[PDB]
Amino acid sequence: AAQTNAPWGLARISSTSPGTSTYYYDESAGQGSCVYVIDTGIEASHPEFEGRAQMVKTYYYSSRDGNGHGTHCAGTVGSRTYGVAKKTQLFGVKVLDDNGSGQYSTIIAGMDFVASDKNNRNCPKGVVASLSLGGGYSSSVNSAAARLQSSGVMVAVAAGNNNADARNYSPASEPSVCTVGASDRYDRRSSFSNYGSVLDIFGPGTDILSTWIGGSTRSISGTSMATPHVAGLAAYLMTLGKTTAASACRYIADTANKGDLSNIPFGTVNLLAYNNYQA
């Protein structure tokens, strides 16, 4: 399939070179998989989700996304125009309040919720969790992300926006999950993106157009935007049968565009997520 005039990040993950505008992907489009978006929620009513989005859990007085962050990320995972895996099922777990904040103890419960709740869903092609969140280092948060991964879910987590080494941040510093840095449309490391050896992969993170609350759309930047690209790629690849929850981060790394990013610090991987699709 081909999506003409796709957002630059979508075109990027299906191309060898920057600066193209079409997104090439297999029409299975992640059908049969499930991506849990652990964030501020998802405006499931957005026409862009086609009713493939649904909230499954909140830790606050409402499950609505009063912020837009979560909706934007869910947009990049699986929305019809802005998404990597256009036929995936999206589950919203609201661990962040409408200011984008949440206690670590709430984030952990959310992860443990997903590890159990996937046994309540039909995901014959496997399960992904996208975690566009983080703060300072916490072994308990890392441990929770490790449990979520161990339970059979492909966990993608943002590297952080401090332009520092992600080892001082969680869950980004957890080895067994997929930690996602951010790059821009010119294959440059995004100015804010954390780095370090714990990074597994880079994704489009600068000027990412996605869904917003109120049935709108907008462009924002962050590793929070890179993460859902890789989460959606994972779901796409598992539907294709090419990898599994446990092996997807390694597979994406194996098959990534290598050596193409500028301003990658010594000791940080130079790998850009890539679907390797051939029409």
Side-chain angles (χ1 to χ4, degrees), residues 1-26 28-86 88-257 259-279:
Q3 166 180 20
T4 56
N5 295 292
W8 83 260
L10 294 192
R12 193 53 191 101
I13 71 146
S14 62
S15 161
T16 290
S17 34
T20 75
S21 85
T22 305
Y23 173 43
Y24 304 99
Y25 64 98
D26 184 289
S28 58
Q31 189 174 351
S33 65
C34 303
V35 185
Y36 284 88
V37 174
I38 299 179
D39 211 272
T40 53
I42 306 167
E43 196 175 89
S45 75
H46 200 301
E48 278 284 323
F49 300 119
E50 317 173 293
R52 290 178 287 101
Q54 64 180 279
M55 291 297 318
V56 295
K57 180 71 177 196
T58 185
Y59 295 85
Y60 304 85
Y61 61 83
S62 169
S63 57
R64 298 289 289 170
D65 177 19
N67 187 284
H69 190 250
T71 294
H72 195 264
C73 296
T76 299
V77 175
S79 85
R80 92 194 145 183
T81 307
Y82 311 96
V84 173
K86 307 189 166 299
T88 192
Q89 176 63 228
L90 296 157
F91 301 131
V93 178
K94 176 169 179 58
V95 304
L96 311 173
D97 69 23
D98 292 336
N99 294 315
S101 266
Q103 282 297 117
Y104 268 169
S105 65
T106 302
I107 293 166
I108 290 156
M111 290 184 246
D112 282 317
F113 173 84
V114 175
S116 190
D117 184 86
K118 69 186 202 308
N119 310 305
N120 298 329
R121 318 289 165 185
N122 275 308
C123 306
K125 303 279 154 173
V127 183
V128 175
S130 181
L131 280 77
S132 287
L133 52 69
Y137 179 81
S138 159
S139 49
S140 301
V141 164
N142 283 14
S143 176
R147 294 199 295 279
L148 183 63
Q149 177 69 47
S150 155
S151 89
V153 183
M154 189 294 180
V155 184
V157 315
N161 304 316
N162 320 88
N163 182 48
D165 195 309
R167 66 210 299 199
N168 293 310
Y169 299 88
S170 285
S173 53
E174 164 51 39
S176 82
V177 302
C178 214
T179 303
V180 187
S183 57
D184 70 21
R185 67 174 72 249
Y186 303 111
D187 282 359
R188 298 186 299 227
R189 181 171 61 92
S190 308
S191 65
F192 47 79
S193 180
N194 283 350
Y195 50 93
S197 48
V198 82
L199 259 80
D200 307 308
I201 197 72
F202 279 83
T206 298
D207 302 333
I208 308 303
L209 185 58
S210 203
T211 43
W212 202 251
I213 56 175
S216 59
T217 57
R218 74 176 58 181
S219 196
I220 55 175
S221 316
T223 61
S224 283
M225 278 71 266
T227 306
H229 281 92
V230 170
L233 184 46
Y236 169 76
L237 292 168
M238 293 147 51
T239 284
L240 279 189
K242 302 262 180 83
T243 187
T244 75
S247 46
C249 192
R250 186 184 308 240
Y251 181 101
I252 292 170
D254 290 358
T255 63
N257 288 321
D260 301 352
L261 302 169
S262 66
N263 199 32
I264 300 300
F266 204 80
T268 297
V269 297
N270 196 314
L271 301 164
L272 195 61
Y274 174 48
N275 71 350
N276 197 233
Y277 174 74
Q278 306 309 138

mmCIF file with all atom_site columns, all heavy atoms in Angstrom, residues 125-148:
data_model
loop_
_atom_site.group_PDB
_atom_site.id
_atom_site.type_symbol
_atom_site.label_atom_id
_atom_site.label_alt_id
_atom_site.label_comp_id
_atom_site.label_asym_id
_atom_site.label_entity_id
_atom_site.label_seq_id
_atom_site.pdbx_PDB_ins_code
_atom_site.Cartn_x
_atom_site.Cartn_y
_atom_site.Cartn_z
_atom_site.occupancy
_atom_site.B_iso_or_equiv
_atom_site.pdbx_formal_charge
_atom_site.auth_seq_id
_atom_site.auth_comp_id
_atom_site.auth_asym_id
_atom_site.auth_atom_id
_atom_site.pdbx_PDB_model_num
ATOM 1   N N   . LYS A 1 125 ? -2.183 -11.680 17.051 1.00 0.00 ? 125 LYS A N   1
ATOM 2   C CA  . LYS A 1 125 ? -0.889 -11.330 16.483 1.00 0.00 ? 125 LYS A CA  1
ATOM 3   C C   . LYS A 1 125 ? 0.077  -10.708 17.493 1.00 0.00 ? 125 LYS A C   1
ATOM 4   O O   . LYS A 1 125 ? 1.175  -10.288 17.113 1.00 0.00 ? 125 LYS A O   1
ATOM 5   C CB  . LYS A 1 125 ? -1.085 -10.391 15.297 1.00 0.00 ? 125 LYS A CB  1
ATOM 6   C CG  . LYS A 1 125 ? -1.976 -10.986 14.232 1.00 0.00 ? 125 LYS A CG  1
ATOM 7   C CD  . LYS A 1 125 ? -1.212 -11.923 13.341 1.00 0.00 ? 125 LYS A CD  1
ATOM 8   C CE  . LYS A 1 125 ? -2.151 -12.958 12.731 1.00 0.00 ? 125 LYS A CE  1
ATOM 9   N NZ  . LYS A 1 125 ? -1.441 -13.788 11.710 1.00 0.00 ? 125 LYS A NZ  1
ATOM 10  N N   . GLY A 1 126 ? -0.298 -10.623 18.754 1.00 0.00 ? 126 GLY A N   1
ATOM 11  C CA  . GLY A 1 126 ? 0.612  -10.158 19.775 1.00 0.00 ? 126 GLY A CA  1
ATOM 12  C C   . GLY A 1 126 ? 0.238  -8.768  20.248 1.00 0.00 ? 126 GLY A C   1
ATOM 13  O O   . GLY A 1 126 ? -0.662 -8.109  19.721 1.00 0.00 ? 126 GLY A O   1
ATOM 14  N N   . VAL A 1 127 ? 0.995  -8.317  21.233 1.00 0.00 ? 127 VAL A N   1
ATOM 15  C CA  . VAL A 1 127 ? 0.619  -7.163  22.033 1.00 0.00 ? 127 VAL A CA  1
ATOM 16  C C   . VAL A 1 127 ? 1.817  -6.228  22.170 1.00 0.00 ? 127 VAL A C   1
ATOM 17  O O   . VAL A 1 127 ? 2.966  -6.680  22.292 1.00 0.00 ? 127 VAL A O   1
ATOM 18  C CB  . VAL A 1 127 ? 0.074  -7.632  23.401 1.00 0.00 ? 127 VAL A CB  1
ATOM 19  C CG1 . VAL A 1 127 ? -0.405 -6.464  24.231 1.00 0.00 ? 127 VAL A CG1 1
ATOM 20  C CG2 . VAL A 1 127 ? -1.066 -8.657  23.190 1.00 0.00 ? 127 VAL A CG2 1
ATOM 21  N N   . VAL A 1 128 ? 1.549  -4.921  22.098 1.00 0.00 ? 128 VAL A N   1
ATOM 22  C CA  . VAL A 1 128 ? 2.567  -3.884  22.252 1.00 0.00 ? 128 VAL A CA  1
ATOM 23  C C   . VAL A 1 128 ? 2.075  -2.910  23.315 1.00 0.00 ? 128 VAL A C   1
ATOM 24  O O   . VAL A 1 128 ? 0.873  -2.672  23.434 1.00 0.00 ? 128 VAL A O   1
ATOM 25  C CB  . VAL A 1 128 ? 2.792  -3.138  20.911 1.00 0.00 ? 128 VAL A CB  1
ATOM 26  C CG1 . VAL A 1 128 ? 3.763  -1.948  21.064 1.00 0.00 ? 128 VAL A CG1 1
ATOM 27  C CG2 . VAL A 1 128 ? 3.243  -4.086  19.824 1.00 0.00 ? 128 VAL A CG2 1
ATOM 28  N N   . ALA A 1 129 ? 3.007  -2.346  24.095 1.00 0.00 ? 129 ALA A N   1
ATOM 29  C CA  . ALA A 1 129 ? 2.725  -1.204  24.965 1.00 0.00 ? 129 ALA A CA  1
ATOM 30  C C   . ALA A 1 129 ? 3.653  -0.063  24.573 1.00 0.00 ? 129 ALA A C   1
ATOM 31  O O   . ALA A 1 129 ? 4.865  -0.268  24.395 1.00 0.00 ? 129 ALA A O   1
ATOM 32  C CB  . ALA A 1 129 ? 2.903  -1.517  26.458 1.00 0.00 ? 129 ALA A CB  1
ATOM 33  N N   . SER A 1 130 ? 3.080  1.124   24.405 1.00 0.00 ? 130 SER A N   1
ATOM 34  C CA  . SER A 1 130 ? 3.830  2.322   24.070 1.00 0.00 ? 130 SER A CA  1
ATOM 35  C C   . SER A 1 130 ? 3.810  3.242   25.293 1.00 0.00 ? 130 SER A C   1
ATOM 36  O O   . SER A 1 130 ? 2.735  3.571   25.817 1.00 0.00 ? 130 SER A O   1
ATOM 37  C CB  . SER A 1 130 ? 3.233  2.987   22.825 1.00 0.00 ? 130 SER A CB  1
ATOM 38  O OG  . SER A 1 130 ? 3.950  4.152   22.444 1.00 0.00 ? 130 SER A OG  1
ATOM 39  N N   . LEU A 1 131 ? 5.001  3.606   25.781 1.00 0.00 ? 131 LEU A N   1
ATOM 40  C CA  . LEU A 1 131 ? 5.146  4.366   27.029 1.00 0.00 ? 131 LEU A CA  1
ATOM 41  C C   . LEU A 1 131 ? 5.889  5.664   26.740 1.00 0.00 ? 131 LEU A C   1
ATOM 42  O O   . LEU A 1 131 ? 7.119  5.727   26.808 1.00 0.00 ? 131 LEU A O   1
ATOM 43  C CB  . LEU A 1 131 ? 5.846  3.574   28.091 1.00 0.00 ? 131 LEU A CB  1
ATOM 44  C CG  . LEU A 1 131 ? 5.007  2.562   28.848 1.00 0.00 ? 131 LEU A CG  1
ATOM 45  C CD1 . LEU A 1 131 ? 4.791  1.324   28.005 1.00 0.00 ? 131 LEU A CD1 1
ATOM 46  C CD2 . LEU A 1 131 ? 5.782  2.212   30.092 1.00 0.00 ? 131 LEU A CD2 1
ATOM 47  N N   . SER A 1 132 ? 5.132  6.704   26.416 1.00 0.00 ? 132 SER A N   1
ATOM 48  C CA  . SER A 1 132 ? 5.699  8.022   26.126 1.00 0.00 ? 132 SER A CA  1
ATOM 49  C C   . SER A 1 132 ? 5.702  8.852   27.413 1.00 0.00 ? 132 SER A C   1
ATOM 50  O O   . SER A 1 132 ? 4.981  9.844   27.571 1.00 0.00 ? 132 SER A O   1
ATOM 51  C CB  . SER A 1 132 ? 4.923  8.684   24.995 1.00 0.00 ? 132 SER A CB  1
ATOM 52  O OG  . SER A 1 132 ? 5.241  8.055   23.756 1.00 0.00 ? 132 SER A OG  1
ATOM 53  N N   . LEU A 1 133 ? 6.512  8.391   28.361 1.00 0.00 ? 133 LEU A N   1
ATOM 54  C CA  . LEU A 1 133 ? 6.560  8.999   29.680 1.00 0.00 ? 133 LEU A CA  1
ATOM 55  C C   . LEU A 1 133 ? 7.883  8.632   30.335 1.00 0.00 ? 133 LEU A C   1
ATOM 56  O O   . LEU A 1 133 ? 8.584  7.715   29.899 1.00 0.00 ? 133 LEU A O   1
ATOM 57  C CB  . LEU A 1 133 ? 5.367  8.559   30.538 1.00 0.00 ? 133 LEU A CB  1
ATOM 58  C CG  . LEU A 1 133 ? 5.024  7.074   30.711 1.00 0.00 ? 133 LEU A CG  1
ATOM 59  C CD1 . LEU A 1 133 ? 6.072  6.351   31.538 1.00 0.00 ? 133 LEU A CD1 1
ATOM 60  C CD2 . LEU A 1 133 ? 3.645  6.932   31.351 1.00 0.00 ? 133 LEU A CD2 1
ATOM 61  N N   . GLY A 1 134 ? 8.191  9.330   31.415 1.00 0.00 ? 134 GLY A N   1
ATOM 62  C CA  . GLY A 1 134 ? 9.397  9.065   32.167 1.00 0.00 ? 134 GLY A CA  1
ATOM 63  C C   . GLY A 1 134 ? 9.753  10.217  33.072 1.00 0.00 ? 134 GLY A C   1
ATOM 64  O O   . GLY A 1 134 ? 9.298  11.351  32.892 1.00 0.00 ? 134 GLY A O   1
ATOM 65  N N   . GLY A 1 135 ? 10.578 9.900   34.066 1.00 0.00 ? 135 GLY A N   1
ATOM 66  C CA  . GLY A 1 135 ? 11.215 10.880  34.930 1.00 0.00 ? 135 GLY A CA  1
ATOM 67  C C   . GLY A 1 135 ? 12.544 10.317  35.387 1.00 0.00 ? 135 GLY A C   1
ATOM 68  O O   . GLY A 1 135 ? 13.179 9.532   34.677 1.00 0.00 ? 135 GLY A O   1
ATOM 69  N N   . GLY A 1 136 ? 12.967 10.708  36.582 1.00 0.00 ? 136 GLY A N   1
ATOM 70  C CA  . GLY A 1 136 ? 14.253 10.279  37.093 1.00 0.00 ? 136 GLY A CA  1
ATOM 71  C C   . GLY A 1 136 ? 14.304 8.782   37.318 1.00 0.00 ? 136 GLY A C   1
ATOM 72  O O   . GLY A 1 136 ? 13.276 8.098   37.365 1.00 0.00 ? 136 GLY A O   1
ATOM 73  N N   . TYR A 1 137 ? 15.532 8.288   37.490 1.00 0.00 ? 137 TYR A N   1
ATOM 74  C CA  . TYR A 1 137 ? 15.786 6.860   37.645 1.00 0.00 ? 137 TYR A CA  1
ATOM 75  C C   . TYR A 1 137 ? 14.979 6.294   38.808 1.00 0.00 ? 137 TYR A C   1
ATOM 76  O O   . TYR A 1 137 ? 14.954 6.872   39.902 1.00 0.00 ? 137 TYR A O   1
ATOM 77  C CB  . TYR A 1 137 ? 17.279 6.593   37.908 1.00 0.00 ? 137 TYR A CB  1
ATOM 78  C CG  . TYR A 1 137 ? 17.534 5.120   38.094 1.00 0.00 ? 137 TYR A CG  1
ATOM 79  C CD1 . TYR A 1 137 ? 17.646 4.292   36.986 1.00 0.00 ? 137 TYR A CD1 1
ATOM 80  C CD2 . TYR A 1 137 ? 17.603 4.541   39.362 1.00 0.00 ? 137 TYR A CD2 1
ATOM 81  C CE1 . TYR A 1 137 ? 17.839 2.935   37.114 1.00 0.00 ? 137 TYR A CE1 1
ATOM 82  C CE2 . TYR A 1 137 ? 17.797 3.166   39.505 1.00 0.00 ? 137 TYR A CE2 1
ATOM 83  C CZ  . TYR A 1 137 ? 17.919 2.375   38.368 1.00 0.00 ? 137 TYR A CZ  1
ATOM 84  O OH  . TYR A 1 137 ? 18.113 1.012   38.464 1.00 0.00 ? 137 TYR A OH  1
ATOM 85  N N   . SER A 1 138 ? 14.330 5.155   38.571 1.00 0.00 ? 138 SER A N   1
ATOM 86  C CA  . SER A 1 138 ? 13.638 4.418   39.628 1.00 0.00 ? 138 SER A CA  1
ATOM 87  C C   . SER A 1 138 ? 13.753 2.945   39.292 1.00 0.00 ? 138 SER A C   1
ATOM 88  O O   . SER A 1 138 ? 13.306 2.526   38.220 1.00 0.00 ? 138 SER A O   1
ATOM 89  C CB  . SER A 1 138 ? 12.159 4.812   39.714 1.00 0.00 ? 138 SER A CB  1
ATOM 90  O OG  . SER A 1 138 ? 11.409 3.795   40.370 1.00 0.00 ? 138 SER A OG  1
ATOM 91  N N   . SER A 1 139 ? 14.363 2.164   40.177 1.00 0.00 ? 139 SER A N   1
ATOM 92  C CA  . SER A 1 139 ? 14.414 0.724   39.930 1.00 0.00 ? 139 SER A CA  1
ATOM 93  C C   . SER A 1 139 ? 13.015 0.114   39.863 1.00 0.00 ? 139 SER A C   1
ATOM 94  O O   . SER A 1 139 ? 12.776 -0.828  39.094 1.00 0.00 ? 139 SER A O   1
ATOM 95  C CB  . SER A 1 139 ? 15.248 0.040   41.006 1.00 0.00 ? 139 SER A CB  1
ATOM 96  O OG  . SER A 1 139 ? 14.814 0.482   42.269 1.00 0.00 ? 139 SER A OG  1
ATOM 97  N N   . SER A 1 140 ? 12.073 0.622   40.665 1.00 0.00 ? 140 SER A N   1
ATOM 98  C CA  . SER A 1 140 ? 10.733 0.026   40.671 1.00 0.00 ? 140 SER A CA  1
ATOM 99  C C   . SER A 1 140 ? 10.022 0.229   39.343 1.00 0.00 ? 140 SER A C   1
ATOM 100 O O   . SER A 1 140 ? 9.346  -0.682  38.844 1.00 0.00 ? 140 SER A O   1
ATOM 101 C CB  . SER A 1 140 ? 9.883  0.569   41.821 1.00 0.00 ? 140 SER A CB  1
ATOM 102 O OG  . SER A 1 140 ? 10.496 0.307   43.067 1.00 0.00 ? 140 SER A OG  1
ATOM 103 N N   . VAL A 1 141 ? 10.178 1.411   38.748 1.00 0.00 ? 141 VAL A N   1
ATOM 104 C CA  . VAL A 1 141 ? 9.577  1.692   37.445 1.00 0.00 ? 141 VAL A CA  1
ATOM 105 C C   . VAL A 1 141 ? 10.217 0.824   36.374 1.00 0.00 ? 141 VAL A C   1
ATOM 106 O O   . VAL A 1 141 ? 9.524  0.187   35.569 1.00 0.00 ? 141 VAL A O   1
ATOM 107 C CB  . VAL A 1 141 ? 9.681  3.198   37.125 1.00 0.00 ? 141 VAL A CB  1
ATOM 108 C CG1 . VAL A 1 141 ? 9.432  3.485   35.638 1.00 0.00 ? 141 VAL A CG1 1
ATOM 109 C CG2 . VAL A 1 141 ? 8.714  3.979   38.018 1.00 0.00 ? 141 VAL A CG2 1
ATOM 110 N N   . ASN A 1 142 ? 11.554 0.762   36.367 1.00 0.00 ? 142 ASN A N   1
ATOM 111 C CA  . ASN A 1 142 ? 12.258 -0.115  35.442 1.00 0.00 ? 142 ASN A CA  1
ATOM 112 C C   . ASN A 1 142 ? 11.774 -1.547  35.600 1.00 0.00 ? 142 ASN A C   1
ATOM 113 O O   . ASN A 1 142 ? 11.504 -2.238  34.606 1.00 0.00 ? 142 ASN A O   1
ATOM 114 C CB  . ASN A 1 142 ? 13.770 -0.047  35.708 1.00 0.00 ? 142 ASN A CB  1
ATOM 115 C CG  . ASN A 1 142 ? 14.430 1.227   35.146 1.00 0.00 ? 142 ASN A CG  1
ATOM 116 O OD1 . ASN A 1 142 ? 13.754 2.200   34.775 1.00 0.00 ? 142 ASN A OD1 1
ATOM 117 N ND2 . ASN A 1 142 ? 15.766 1.242   35.142 1.00 0.00 ? 142 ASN A ND2 1
ATOM 118 N N   . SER A 1 143 ? 11.642 -1.995  36.853 1.00 0.00 ? 143 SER A N   1
ATOM 119 C CA  . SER A 1 143 ? 11.230 -3.359  37.137 1.00 0.00 ? 143 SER A CA  1
ATOM 120 C C   . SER A 1 143 ? 9.833  -3.610  36.604 1.00 0.00 ? 143 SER A C   1
ATOM 121 O O   . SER A 1 143 ? 9.546  -4.680  36.041 1.00 0.00 ? 143 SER A O   1
ATOM 122 C CB  . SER A 1 143 ? 11.276 -3.580  38.645 1.00 0.00 ? 143 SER A CB  1
ATOM 123 O OG  . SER A 1 143 ? 10.800 -4.851  38.995 1.00 0.00 ? 143 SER A OG  1
ATOM 124 N N   . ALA A 1 144 ? 8.956  -2.621  36.746 1.00 0.00 ? 144 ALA A N   1
ATOM 125 C CA  . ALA A 1 144 ? 7.611  -2.762  36.203 1.00 0.00 ? 144 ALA A CA  1
ATOM 126 C C   . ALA A 1 144 ? 7.636  -2.876  34.685 1.00 0.00 ? 144 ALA A C   1
ATOM 127 O O   . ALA A 1 144 ? 6.918  -3.699  34.117 1.00 0.00 ? 144 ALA A O   1
ATOM 128 C CB  . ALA A 1 144 ? 6.708  -1.622  36.661 1.00 0.00 ? 144 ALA A CB  1
ATOM 129 N N   . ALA A 1 145 ? 8.470  -2.076  34.012 1.00 0.00 ? 145 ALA A N   1
ATOM 130 C CA  . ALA A 1 145 ? 8.566  -2.188  32.565 1.00 0.00 ? 145 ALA A CA  1
ATOM 131 C C   . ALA A 1 145 ? 9.133  -3.542  32.172 1.00 0.00 ? 145 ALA A C   1
ATOM 132 O O   . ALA A 1 145 ? 8.674  -4.144  31.200 1.00 0.00 ? 145 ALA A O   1
ATOM 133 C CB  . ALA A 1 145 ? 9.398  -1.047  31.990 1.00 0.00 ? 145 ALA A CB  1
ATOM 134 N N   . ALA A 1 146 ? 10.082 -4.060  32.968 1.00 0.00 ? 146 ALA A N   1
ATOM 135 C CA  . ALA A 1 146 ? 10.649 -5.378  32.715 1.00 0.00 ? 146 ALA A CA  1
ATOM 136 C C   . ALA A 1 146 ? 9.594  -6.474  32.853 1.00 0.00 ? 146 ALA A C   1
ATOM 137 O O   . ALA A 1 146 ? 9.520  -7.380  32.012 1.00 0.00 ? 146 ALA A O   1
ATOM 138 C CB  . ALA A 1 146 ? 11.848 -5.619  33.636 1.00 0.00 ? 146 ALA A CB  1
ATOM 139 N N   . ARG A 1 147 ? 8.750  -6.391  33.886 1.00 0.00 ? 147 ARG A N   1
ATOM 140 C CA  . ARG A 1 147 ? 7.658  -7.351  34.045 1.00 0.00 ? 147 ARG A CA  1
ATOM 141 C C   . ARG A 1 147 ? 6.698  -7.299  32.864 1.00 0.00 ? 147 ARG A C   1
ATOM 142 O O   . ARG A 1 147 ? 6.288  -8.346  32.341 1.00 0.00 ? 147 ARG A O   1
ATOM 143 C CB  . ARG A 1 147 ? 6.886  -7.071  35.332 1.00 0.00 ? 147 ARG A CB  1
ATOM 144 C CG  . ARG A 1 147 ? 7.669  -7.295  36.618 1.00 0.00 ? 147 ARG A CG  1
ATOM 145 C CD  . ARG A 1 147 ? 6.712  -7.438  37.790 1.00 0.00 ? 147 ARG A CD  1
ATOM 146 N NE  . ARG A 1 147 ? 5.964  -6.210  38.029 1.00 0.00 ? 147 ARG A NE  1
ATOM 147 C CZ  . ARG A 1 147 ? 6.464  -5.182  38.697 1.00 0.00 ? 147 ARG A CZ  1
ATOM 148 N NH1 . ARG A 1 147 ? 7.705  -5.203  39.156 1.00 0.00 ? 147 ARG A NH1 1
ATOM 149 N NH2 . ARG A 1 147 ? 5.699  -4.116  38.923 1.00 0.00 ? 147 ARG A NH2 1
ATOM 150 N N   . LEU A 1 148 ? 6.318  -6.090  32.436 1.00 0.00 ? 148 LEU A N   1
ATOM 151 C CA  . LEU A 1 148 ? 5.427  -5.957  31.291 1.00 0.00 ? 148 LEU A CA  1
ATOM 152 C C   . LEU A 1 148 ? 6.035  -6.632  30.069 1.00 0.00 ? 148 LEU A C   1
ATOM 153 O O   . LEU A 1 148 ? 5.377  -7.432  29.401 1.00 0.00 ? 148 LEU A O   1
ATOM 154 C CB  . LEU A 1 148 ? 5.093  -4.491  31.030 1.00 0.00 ? 148 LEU A CB  1
ATOM 155 C CG  . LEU A 1 148 ? 4.107  -4.191  29.902 1.00 0.00 ? 148 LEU A CG  1
ATOM 156 C CD1 . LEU A 1 148 ? 2.767  -4.812  30.243 1.00 0.00 ? 148 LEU A CD1 1
ATOM 157 C CD2 . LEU A 1 148 ? 3.977  -2.699  29.670 1.00 0.00 ? 148 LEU A CD2 1
#
